[PDB]
Design a protein around this ligand. Structure first.
Ligand SMILES: C[C@@H](O[C@H]1OCCN(Cc2nc(=O)[nH][nH]2)[C@H]1c1ccc(F)cc1)c1cc(C(F)(F)F)cc(C(F)(F)F)c1
Ligand SMILES: CCCCCCCC/C=C\CCCCCCCC(=O)OC[C@H](O)CO
Length: 398
């Protein structure tokens, strides 16, 4: 029953913010990639499709969807009634599956580099298929939309054929919710977790392979035998228990080079690590005869004890790591923005009366604002994280 003018003008301002920031931002992003085109990569060519879909939904739907919510009267006739219910499903499908396409491309490059699935001509075919499938799934929702003429007003509502329980409308609604949200988010989730583990994480067998024609190494057995020996030694066991997985590997790396008895000698450095004085321990171990003879290896073991990370056994300036951080943020934004929207339309199946009660109009306006804002965050994410994109937007200033 809450209907104040002070609120309506305030909402329209918050809503127009979406339209302006989504058209400007995404067109600049489209521009940056498409021309120069000295930056036209498989990942970026997909991002262009996502930039189009975003700027597109914002132009067409934000205006029409806000007016109807506020006024409860359809002003744009049967054609735009059908179109405003068709295009959002097509635009959301094309966006989420373009995101998946970038995830597949990174996975195939990080995980399977010998098999190349990157092709210029094919990218256009993928973007082509994405849109064919998108407009097909959106079609039934557009088909059944119609305007009912009444004495006081014109109403835009979607009415499916009269079935004994009208199961088709519900099934379709559920399927759309899967293809547009749950299914691709699961797929994107899987790729970036495997790729996340490969780019950031490592292990003792990888470490020992680096630090240590000719036969192959036999670490598999020796690593478990090194662990058994450390837990037998009274000078080494307490230190080892206090250490995390990454630091435990640094201690075993040394036992592999000097041996249990040799490593047991660094009494002070070992009491420092136990006490968790990483920087202090790192300074002391650098003064050893171990460091003087093998500085490169010793520098790697020391920096592992100090940082508690695999940073020493991975390239310093990594461009592959920057893009994955960007894309993960973009996906998590989508997931956050669309969840209340999907829950909102999913509830009439649990409690039908709960929806047609209280002042849900103020809620639907808050829920619909978040969903539509997903359309503007992407250019901001590209500038906040990536070096070239922020220089590109900087170049678009007069
Ligand atoms: C067109 C509209 O659809 C909803 O409003 C009408 C009823 N409709 C249930 C229905 N009954 C049918 O028979 N067909 N659809 C709703 C619905 C349909 C599919 C869903 F997954 C969730 C809700 C819609 C869809 C999305 C999308 F695509 F993101 F979901 C985004 C937006 C916007 F952002 F512009 F507000 C608007
Ligand atoms: C919506 C959520 C979907 C994708 C985001 C999930 C991103 C996956 C998190 C990245 C995995 C990662 O980097 O973890 C490596 C870690 O060092 C060892 O577990």
């Amino acid at each position: 029953f809450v209907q104040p003018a002070w609120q309506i003008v305030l909402w329209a301002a918050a809503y127009t913010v979406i339209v302006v920031t989504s058209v400007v931002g995404n067109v600049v992003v489209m521009w940056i990639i498409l021309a120069h085109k000295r930056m036209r990569t498989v990942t970026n060519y997909f991002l262009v499709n996502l930039a189009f879909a975003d700027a597109s939904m914002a132009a067409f739907n934000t205006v029409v969807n806000f007016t109807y919510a506020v006024h409860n009267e359809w002003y744009y006739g049967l054609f735009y009634c059908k179109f405003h219910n068709f295009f959002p499903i097509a635009a959301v499908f094309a966006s989420i599956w373009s995101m998946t396409a970038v995830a597949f491309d990174r996975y195939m490059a990080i995980i399977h580099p010998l098999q190349p699935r990157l092709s210029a001509t094919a990218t256009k075919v993928v973007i082509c298929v994405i849109w064919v499938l998108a407009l097909l799934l959106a079609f039934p929702a557009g088909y059944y939309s119609t305007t009912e003429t009444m004495p006081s007003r014109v109403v835009c509502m979607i009415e499916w054929p009269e079935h004994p329980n009208k199961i088709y409308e519900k099934v379709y609604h559920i399927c759309v919710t899967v293809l547009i949200y749950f299914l691709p988010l699961l797929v994107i989730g899987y790729a970036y977790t495997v790729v996340g583990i490969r780019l950031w994480a490592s292990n003792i067998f990888e470490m020992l392979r680096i630090d240590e024609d000719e036969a192959e190494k036999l670490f598999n057995q020796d690593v478990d035998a090194a662990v058994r020996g450390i837990l037998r030694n009274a000078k080494l066991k307490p230190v080892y228990d206090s250490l995390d997985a990454v630091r435990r590997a640094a201690l075993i790396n040394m036992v592999f080079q000097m041996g249990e008895t040799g490593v047991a000698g660094f009494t002070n450095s070992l009491r420092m690590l136990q006490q968790k004085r990483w920087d202090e321990a790192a300074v002391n171990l650098a003064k050893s005869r171990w460091y003087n003879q093998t500085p490169n290896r010793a520098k790697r073991v020391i920096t592992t004890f100090r940082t508690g990370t695999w940073d020493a056994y991975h390239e310093q300036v990594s461009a592959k790591r920057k893009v994955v951080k960007m894309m993960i943020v973009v996906v998590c934004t989508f997931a956050i923005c669309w969840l209340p929207f999907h829950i909102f339309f999913l509830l009439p199946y649990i409690n039908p009366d709960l929806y047609l009660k209280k002042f849900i109009q103020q809620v639907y306006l808050a829920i619909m604002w978040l969903a539509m804002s997903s359309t503007m965050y992407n250019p901001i994410i590209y500038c906040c994280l990536n070096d070239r994109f922020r220089l590109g937007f900087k170049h678009a200033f007069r």
